[PDB]
């Protein structure tokens, strides 16, 4: 279940040019994981949400790992490849974290992957605030 979490990051709703524009991906969790509510959910996360999220994972897990994020534009442009890297970076980040039971347990992350509204409103909602 924990590693048995199934993730497609697709649908490169790459919000068109702004010189900083942010790709929004389907995140389909098809998950047999019982650490993920939905047997399938798709959310449509944007880069910013993830980076934060990634950080969140960082934040909820005190030393307890947090691998690399969604891919950096710090060398990236906005290239399909770059965004792919991001997509991938997430995929990876996510992949691993899912096959780490703990990082996969971040509730924000459950809500995040299993609800589209971004990390943010999930994150209020969770500390009952």
């Amino acid at each position: 279940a924990r590693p048995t979490f199934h993730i497609t990051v697709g649908d490169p709703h790459k919000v068109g040019d702004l010189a900083t524009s942010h790709i929004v991906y389907s995140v389909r969790t098809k998950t047999t994981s019982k650490a993920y509510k939905q047997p399938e959910f798709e959310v449509k996360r944007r880069y910013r949400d993830f980076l934060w999220l990634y950080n969140t994972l960082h934040s909820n897990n005190p030393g307890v790992v947090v691998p690399p994020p969604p891919e950096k534009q710090a060398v990236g442009r906005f290239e399909s490849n770059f965004v792919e890297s991001r997509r991938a970076a997430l995929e990876k980040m996510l992949n691993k974290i899912a096959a780490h039971p703990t990082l996969q347990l971040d509730a924000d992350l459950k809500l995040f992957l299993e609800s589209e509204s971004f990390n943010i409103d999930v994150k209020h909602k969770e500390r009952k605030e």
């Binding site: 209020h124 909602k125 969770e126 500390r127 009952k128 605030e129």
Partner: protein, 53 residues
Amino acid sequence: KAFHSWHSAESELMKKKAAQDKLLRQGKTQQDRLNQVNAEVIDAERKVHQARL
């Protein structure tokens, strides 16, 4: 007064509780204030209990 205090623990308790409910049935809810208010609710209930006991 002991009685009084006691109820006071309650009347307050109720307020915090009520507030929680309100955030909740604002619908949206700052989960932040919900938690704070709740923490105080449980204490207040206790307060009611104690002063009373």
